[PDB]
């Protein structure tokens, strides 16, 4: 399944112990009734759960303690009812290892203008005391995420949505693993950055493996798991021209069937959840990995071009907290400079992911030789036209800096005539020519995951949380 | 004639060498029309020319280094046809030592949708490869400009021209010379900064040759060019009751260019385009230089005011790029307050850069106790309504920085016969007081540069490639 | 005969015109003959060649000028032996992209006291103009050279002959390529820098060709090739108990024997001059080359061992400074803690330079589990007593650094039968504890270079000029 069903957040709620056991459980209803009452309407991602109940020091150090063996625990939700002693939010926070969330809520959502005695006062008491933990988680540097208001509200709970899913994301990254076969494409400078502090950083981890390694899984699969893989091609995609059975490139697309289940076949007995493919090395395959990639690139892994580990293990990453909607990843290939139809043509040589798309022509007809490799047989198509967000992140010289455009992707003013493969255009929002200024002046390469899904800011916390500079850019 | 005629700027085309003999070579005849397409009606004033194809490294290493030496050249627009490797221009980029510029640019500006094969995104595929390009330079910290759209624009065709000045005022700033028969004005600080700073920093070799030094080569003047130079002058200029044909005070207004003429000797001997001159020292002289300076400075020349080495320069330099503009030096002489039509007007003692004038009554009424030296002859004319920009410049301890205020000037109200020198009243852009207020507390005086040539955009140039940080104020 | 003799560096004098033109001569009568001096007994590497005497500004700024661009220039050791303003020096000094020395001498090495007018004075006065050079380029923080005495003592002619060997790589590394066959071997850290990062740095180039179209030249050899490179090295290596023409197998020498000769074709064919091996990566070669990297490393290459490119353009770098001397590279094997006779024995798993040896026993008895090939052909050997730096490189989030610990090389405790790998066996210059932790602590893996040839002021003023920050211990 989605990963982001195993993955719990534990819900704390926190108050001043001395205020002996009868408001200390006329609280805890409010927030077993927070927890379990959000979790049956909110339209989350992950169900909450409600563990204790912070007000004892040691027993908030407990919790977080707690938070970081259960694997399972995406991040932690925090929420104070009473005016929580923040110096007893400290020895807790300085360790704690994974998200963190202050909800400035209360139990309710009004001002009871009638009732509103000392006794609602000493017993939620929410406004006040949030600002002495979000010094707590400021003052500490904390990363954290706090969001404010009633649980009942539209963007109040709706936020929420779109965030189980990075906070798991995060936890999820450091279970990044790139397969290489081949290394980076040569003379090239971008698609290239340390290894070693993508792991410190962002917790991913780039294995290489041969490309000959991975011949020998390749060829070595039933010639009739291949059919058994056919029934679904001749099936769930228009195959056509030199694509079907008995008409020209015949073997062809019985190749780039036996290209896929080797490539998943390796991945998985491994560990591998990303990989790359330089054509500068395909030494012992038949035809560039492309249909091969567009069906891997339809079942949650991740992949980058050019032995470009970063649109693999990113393109794993966007992919990971888009079990929710739709995404991508895209190259920059051509452009139009027109008076108003400002835009850029983005598509890659034969890998353009099926996330986008509308029909599916299974198209030949190549010479490709871009590789020096067999006709290629790939997914020809025309995306989406709807939200938009690039991403790409560069290695530049300090750690990395995530570098992102805000767009609106529209349609093509063609089908896809003399063109054999397939695209998802646009022009940038801020502008073309404001949209490559802002960008070709700061980091900014080519291999770019494009996302119609994710939000403009929704992954600035993300980005902030595995702790790397985003130059956004409206 | 001036000095954009004996430099040349170089042009690199940006391919690889994995397309073939004739699909490389396809870019040394489309890069050729850019290039061979801009420079009749192509909207510059400076003269381009192309060089090598752009593939390996040792090419590049070439290419850069060549202009180096070769002083001749000036500087250099690159931009990237297809998807250039960057990492092999790397030694280039940083044995640079001419003004860069990521010419953006594509060859069609369209999207042939009905005939766009692979062939045809294999050539044209600029939305990559000058982001390839792009992404070395934000990373290898160039001081580099970014001009966006097709060449066939003539918008960004001034983008290009507006670009092509700063790239000649740069290197030309590195050669500029000061003589200085005068210091600093007794203990005044702003026409002070650091010697061995600006030189290294902004070329400006400043050297100090005597006053006296001066007064021998003003008295080394042929009383026949005290004649001869004479009636050059007026046939070109309208006097006042006083400098008349044989009025009492002839003789001073004609030993009042015996002063510019024997400047210009000593100016172009010593080979001193910036020159500097102090009231609080002329004890040798007569009277004190004033039309003599306007008649170096329409001409051309730097001149610094009471003895302002900086200025002279900031007037030298932002001329200097003027190969066909206006341009300016203003000391802020008065502010004129009135809650809803408010304004700043700017003279000197004598000198107000005769470049923006449109008459030229050689007034006199000659008053100086300033000096302590003989009625003087000048100027006072008028100077031009509609807009320019004025910057100033100060060494503010960590090193110098530049202001650069965005204002409007135009004509006097009442007639100023009782002002026997120039004026030119203007304004501010976001308020008299604002426009005063931050460039108050953030220090720069007086000593301007009105240049009604350039611009924001166009200044934010010389700066950003001299390394100097700049304060923006409109 | 070496590149390094097709090298020279240039050798100026200064001072200003204002000085009597015969004094002015009266120096390039005294500079002349120490430069000759510095010739005609030096026994410095590299030439010298007295260019321009230097005055004026462009005098100075002009001659700077060549010296970046006459690539057979290596360095320019200034002297100046008169008060050389310095003004004159600054954008002279700041368009210099080449090692600079500014030698710090006197002509005689005795104050005259029966014949010193003031013209003994006005001349040969460079300890108070020598300093007037360093303080524009110590301001403007040039990565400059600086020796002091008398230009004959053999040890102020000592420290130039080193340095002229150092100067000499600050102008071969911008030239190192590194070919790479696999990328780096699963897991490890140390051996993994910045590919782009340092080729702005320390100027070396890493592009990386398939395993494969190495195993093509390889495998393309000859026997008459190979029987021919086959049979000199039986002039050389006493082949021991399992080489013999039917003797068991020597298919398993000629391998590496053709191994050699098929690596040296695939480099010197593109262009590299250093190289790795991922034995993780062996598909196509036979055994896991040894012998024929032992070989190369003697032919003057650089190879880096488990994939590391930092050894590989490292060892080329520094062994290209060590021509007509030593040097190699090295991984610690292990230790021997004794208290006293505590030590580190290093080697590698075959790959020895046998430049340090004193002996040379062909061998095998391979059986190398390592890479699951036939049994591999190597060279055994015991090194060389004595001194040396241990250098290496290693990129820390921030950007490379050298770490250095001195060392005292020695010879074996006893002969090592079963242990069928040449082997060195040293310890450091302070301690298996007091320096071993140092270098724990500053980082920098086991990879190394040794080089009982190079000497850390020579080191360090390499690093010197590349800025890389290195770590002393000993």
């Given at each position: 399944?989605?990963?982001?069903?195993?993955?719990?957040?534990?819900?704390?709620?926190?108050?001043?112990?001395?205020?002996?056991?009868?408001?200390?459980?006329?609280?805890?209803?409010?927030?077993?009734?927070?927890v379990?009452?959000?979790?049956?309407?909110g339209?989350?991602?992950?169900?909450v759960?409600?563990?204790?109940?912070?007000t004892?020091?040691?027993?908030?150090t407990?919790?977080?303690?707690?938070?970081?063996?259960?694997?399972?625990?995406?991040?932690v939700?925090?929420?104070?009812?009473?005016?929580?002693?923040?110096?007893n939010?400290?020895?807790?926070?300085?360790?704690?290892?994974?998200?963190?969330?202050?909800?400035?809520?209360?139990?309710?959502?009004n001002?009871?203008?009638?009732?509103?005695?000392?006794?609602?006062?000493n017993?939620?008491?929410?406004?006040?005391?949030?600002?002495?933990?979000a010094?707590?988680?400021?003052?500490?540097?904390?990363?954290?995420?706090?969001?404010?208001?009633?649980?009942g509200?539209?963007?109040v709970?709706?936020?929420?949505a779109?965030?189980?899913?990075?906070?798991?994301?995060?936890?999820?990254?450091?279970?990044?693993?790139?397969?290489?076969?081949?290394?980076?494409?040569?003379?090239?400078?971008?698609?290239?950055?340390?290894?070693?502090?993508?792991?410190?950083?962002?917790?991913?981890?780039?294995?290489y493996?041969?490309?000959?390694?991975?011949?020998?899984?390749?060829?070595?699969i039933?010639?009739?798991?291949?059919?058994?893989a056919?029934?679904?091609?001749?099936?769930?995609y228009?195959?056509?021209?030199?694509?079907?059975?008995?008409?020209?490139?015949?073997h062809?697309?019985?190749?780039?069937?036996?290209?896929?289940?080797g490539?998943?076949?390796?991945?998985?007995d491994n560990?591998?959840d990303?990989?790359?493919?330089?054509?500068?090395?395909?030494e012992?395959?038949?035809q560039?990995?492309?249909?091969?990639?567009?069906?891997?690139?339809?079942?949650?892994?991740?992949?980058?071009?050019?032995?470009?580990?970063?649109?693999?293990?990113?393109?794993?990453?966007?992919?990971?907290a888009?079990?929710?909607?739709?995404?991508?990843?895209?190259?920059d290939?051509?452009?139009?400079l027109?008076?108003?139809?400002?835009?850029?043509?983005?598509?890659?040589?034969?890998?353009?992911?099926?996330?986008?798309?509308?029909?599916?022509?299974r198209v030949?007809?190549?010479?490709?030789?871009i590789?020096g490799?067999?006709?290629?047989?790939?997914?020809?198509?025309?995306?989406?036209?709807?939200?938009?967000?690039?991403?790409?992140?560069?290695y530049?010289?300090?750690?990395?800096?995530?570098?992102?455009?805000?767009v609106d992707?529209?349609?093509?003013e063609?089908?896809?005539p003399?063109?054999?493969v397939?695209?998802?255009?646009?022009?940038?929002?801020?502008?073309?020519?404001?949209?490559?200024k802002?960008?070709?002046?700061?980091?900014?390469?080519?291999?770019?995951v494009?996302t119609?899904?994710?939000?403009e800011?929704?992954?600035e916390?993300?980005?902030?949380?595995?702790?790397?500079?985003?130059?956004?850019i409206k």
């Amino acid at each position: 399944m989605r990963k982001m069903q195993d993955y719990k957040f534990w819900f704390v709620v926190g108050s001043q112990p001395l205020y002996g056991p009868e408001a200390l459980a006329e609280v805890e209803k409010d927030a077993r009734k927070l927890v379990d009452g959000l979790n049956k309407g909110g339209k989350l991602d992950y169900p909450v759960e409600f563990k204790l109940v912070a007000t004892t020091a040691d027993s908030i150090t407990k919790f977080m303690k707690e938070a970081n063996y259960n694997d399972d625990v995406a991040g932690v939700i925090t929420w104070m009812h009473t005016f929580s002693p923040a110096k007893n939010w400290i020895r807790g926070t300085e360790l704690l290892q994974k998200p963190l969330l202050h909800l400035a809520t209360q139990f309710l959502n009004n001002i009871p203008f009638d009732s509103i005695d000392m006794d609602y006062m000493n017993l939620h008491q929410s406004a006040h005391g949030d600002r002495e933990y979000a010094y707590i988680n400021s003052r500490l540097n904390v990363p954290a995420a706090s969001v404010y208001g009633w649980w009942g509200d539209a963007d109040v709970q709706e936020q929420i949505a779109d965030w189980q899913h990075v906070a798991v994301a995060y936890n999820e990254s450091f279970h990044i693993k790139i397969a290489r076969f081949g290394d980076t494409m040569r003379d090239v400078a971008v698609t290239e950055g340390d290894k070693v502090a993508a792991q410190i950083k962002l917790g991913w981890t780039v294995d290489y493996y041969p490309t000959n390694e991975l011949v020998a899984v390749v060829n070595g699969i039933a010639e009739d798991e291949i059919d058994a893989a056919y029934k679904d091609l001749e099936a769930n995609y228009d195959l056509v021209e030199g694509d079907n059975d008995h008409e020209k490139y015949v073997h062809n697309v019985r190749y780039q069937l036996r290209e896929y289940l080797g490539i998943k076949k390796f991945l998985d007995d491994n560990g591998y959840d990303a990989f790359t493919d330089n054509f500068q090395d395909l030494e012992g395959l038949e035809q560039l990995p492309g249909l091969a990639v567009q069906l891997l690139m339809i079942d949650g892994y991740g992949f980058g071009p050019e032995g470009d580990f970063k649109m693999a293990g990113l393109t794993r990453l966007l992919k990971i907290a888009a079990d929710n909607k739709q995404t991508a990843l895209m190259e920059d290939y051509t452009l139009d400079l027109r008076h108003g139809h400002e835009a850029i043509m983005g598509s890659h040589m034969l890998e353009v992911d099926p996330t986008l798309a509308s029909d599916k022509p299974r198209v030949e007809v190549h010479p490709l030789g871009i590789g020096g490799k067999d006709d290629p047989a790939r997914l020809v198509f025309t995306g989406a036209e709807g939200k938009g967000y690039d991403i790409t992140l560069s290695y530049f010289d300090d750690g990395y800096k995530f570098i992102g455009y805000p767009v609106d992707c529209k349609t093509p003013e063609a089908e896809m005539p003399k063109l054999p493969v397939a695209k998802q255009m646009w022009t940038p929002e801020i502008g073309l020519a404001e949209g490559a200024k802002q960008w070709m002046k700061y980091g900014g390469g080519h291999h770019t995951v494009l996302t119609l899904a994710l939000s403009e800011e929704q992954l600035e916390q993300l980005a902030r949380l595995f702790k790397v500079d985003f130059i956004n850019i409206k």
